[PDB]
Design a protein around this motif. Structure first.
Motif: not given
Ligand SMILES: O=P(O)(O)O[C@@H]1[C@@H](O)[C@H](O)[C@H](O)[C@H](O)[C@H]1OP(=O)(O)O
Ligand SMILES: O=P(O)(O)O[C@@H]1[C@@H](O)[C@H](O)[C@H](O)[C@H](O)[C@H]1OP(=O)(O)O
Lengths: 263, 263
Positions: A246-250
């Motif tokens: 799951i990719p880091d949305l930051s």
């Protein structure tokens, strides 16, 4: 032909699970052979989607998706070159409660697959497969094309997100197989959307006034899509997907105050 | 310490889903800091497994697994250096039917995690993370070490396979999260087992008589484990895992007729 046609049937039986790997791998090999006739392969998949049973139809959709993802690029090029694609906007299998409940997902999934072919037709490449980073297309593309493209991604994303499933509705192997492929497309599509927004910002201050106005609208709609994607990845977390995938949305939403660089 | 201890609690609440990504990523960062005390981190996870609730206990196990996979190698090195690990062989949460049904999976999963630490202790590396190919450890390792190692892989594999779950039992987010991590370990572990068998065969004809006898027994047990792994990947196919992630088992079982090269 007959061997291709038979494999298509086996990938789309009435059994309640996704298409089997052994049939899918044979189809993938079919798309890589210069002598196989792509249109006949595609036609057989479209014919399966005139079946009355939700299981057959949903499996034909998933097979088509997996071929767009893992097959040779000549497959999606053909699909993009046709004028009409899936017409399942009114599909309804009323034979049982699973039928009713799955019919809605069939409608939504088929619209996403149509939009995926239309996007290839418009920009002549697949957003999910091109070079990322800083040496990539989405990072190194001129300001005119950029302004034209990003809105096509946004459109493909919206159709993906309209699948709109909850964790408590992922209750059988067929819809679960659809969801796994949608997950894979969602993360690659986001990567490419993000890259385009980065380029944008890079070039925004150095650009024509009305251009700036267009860019502003794109950054605007990106921020609103950022929260929808968050909701989507949370359904994936709930279901049990490896948290490493799951990719880091930051990344990239602080800057809305260029909404004034139009003084 | 307190920040570490609090994150551990949040990763292991009573909520019925796997540990959240945001807590897991913070723990992974903890294992990469030279100043964090690893034993205190580990101790807090062991304490959560004395809870009476299946949800808390199963989540503490999954957190520990994810750290062995994505954390710095100093984490698994500490776990391997302890003498006692998980003691959940008699766990039973009788508070509700989900409890009874999940208790069995807790027992089995905890045994696999113990065996994973024991294997690191014995060979001083992680079978799942080392270089594959032809330039790798499992491909380029001397005949004495080989004969010693392959049986350790076999052992770790058997404990993994004893999880023994069916598709119809993957019914909640907690057990599903466990299964996704087990899937990832199963494919890497198979790759390494396969590589060792390839090296074996390479060297088999050129080796001592009693050695040959040992090799024969290993190839033998590999073929029997090959069918168990097939059954395991079929549960993954049924559940809906992307067929591109499932490895092709069409590699290395023709040759049983060196069972005579012992003339
Ligand atoms: O073991 P796999 O490869 O699943 O093949 C199975 C095989 O076990 C057997 O039950 C066939 O009669 C069945 O139809 C076939 O499926 P298929 O016809 O879809 O190949
Ligand atoms: O949005 P996320 O990041 O899930 O954080 C949630 C947040 O939405 C809010 O409901 C908190 O009270 C809740 O406890 C927290 O979870 P947490 O305490 O586990 O951080």
């Amino acid at each position: 032909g007959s061997a291709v046609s038979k494999t298509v049937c086996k990938a789309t039986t009435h059994e309640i699970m996704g298409p089997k790997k052994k049939h899918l791998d044979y189809l993938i090999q079919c798309t890589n052979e210069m002598n196989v006739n792509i249109p006949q392969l595609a036609d057989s998949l479209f014919e399966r989607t005139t079946n009355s049973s939700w299981v057959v139809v949903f499996k034909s959709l998933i097979t088509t998706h997996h071929l767009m993802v893992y097959g040779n690029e000549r497959f999606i090029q053909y699909l993009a070159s046709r004028n009409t694609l899936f017409n399942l906007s009114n599909f309804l299998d009323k034979s049982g409660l699973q039928g009713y409940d799955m019919s809605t997902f069939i409608r939504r999934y088929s619209r996403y697959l149509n939009e995926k072919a239309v996007s290839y037709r418009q920009v002549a490449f697949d957003f999910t497969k091109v070079k990322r980073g800083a040496d990539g297309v989405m990072r190194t593309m001129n300001t005119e094309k950029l302004l034209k493209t990003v809105p096509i991604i946004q459109n493909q994303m919206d159709a993906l997100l309209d699948f709109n499933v909850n964790s408590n509705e992922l209750t059988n192997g067929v819809i679960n197989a659809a969801f796994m492929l949608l997950f894979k497309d969602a993360i690659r599509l986001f990567a490419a959307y993000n890259e385009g927004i980065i380029n944008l910002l890079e070039k925004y201050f150095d650009m024509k006034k009305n251009q700036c106005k267009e860019g502003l609208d794109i950054y605007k709609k990106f921020l609103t899509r950022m929260t929808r994607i968050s909701e989507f990845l949370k359904v994936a977390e709930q279901v049990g997907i490896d948290r490493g995938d799951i990719p880091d949305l930051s990344q990239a939403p602080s800057s809305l105050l260029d909404a004034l660089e139009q003084h």
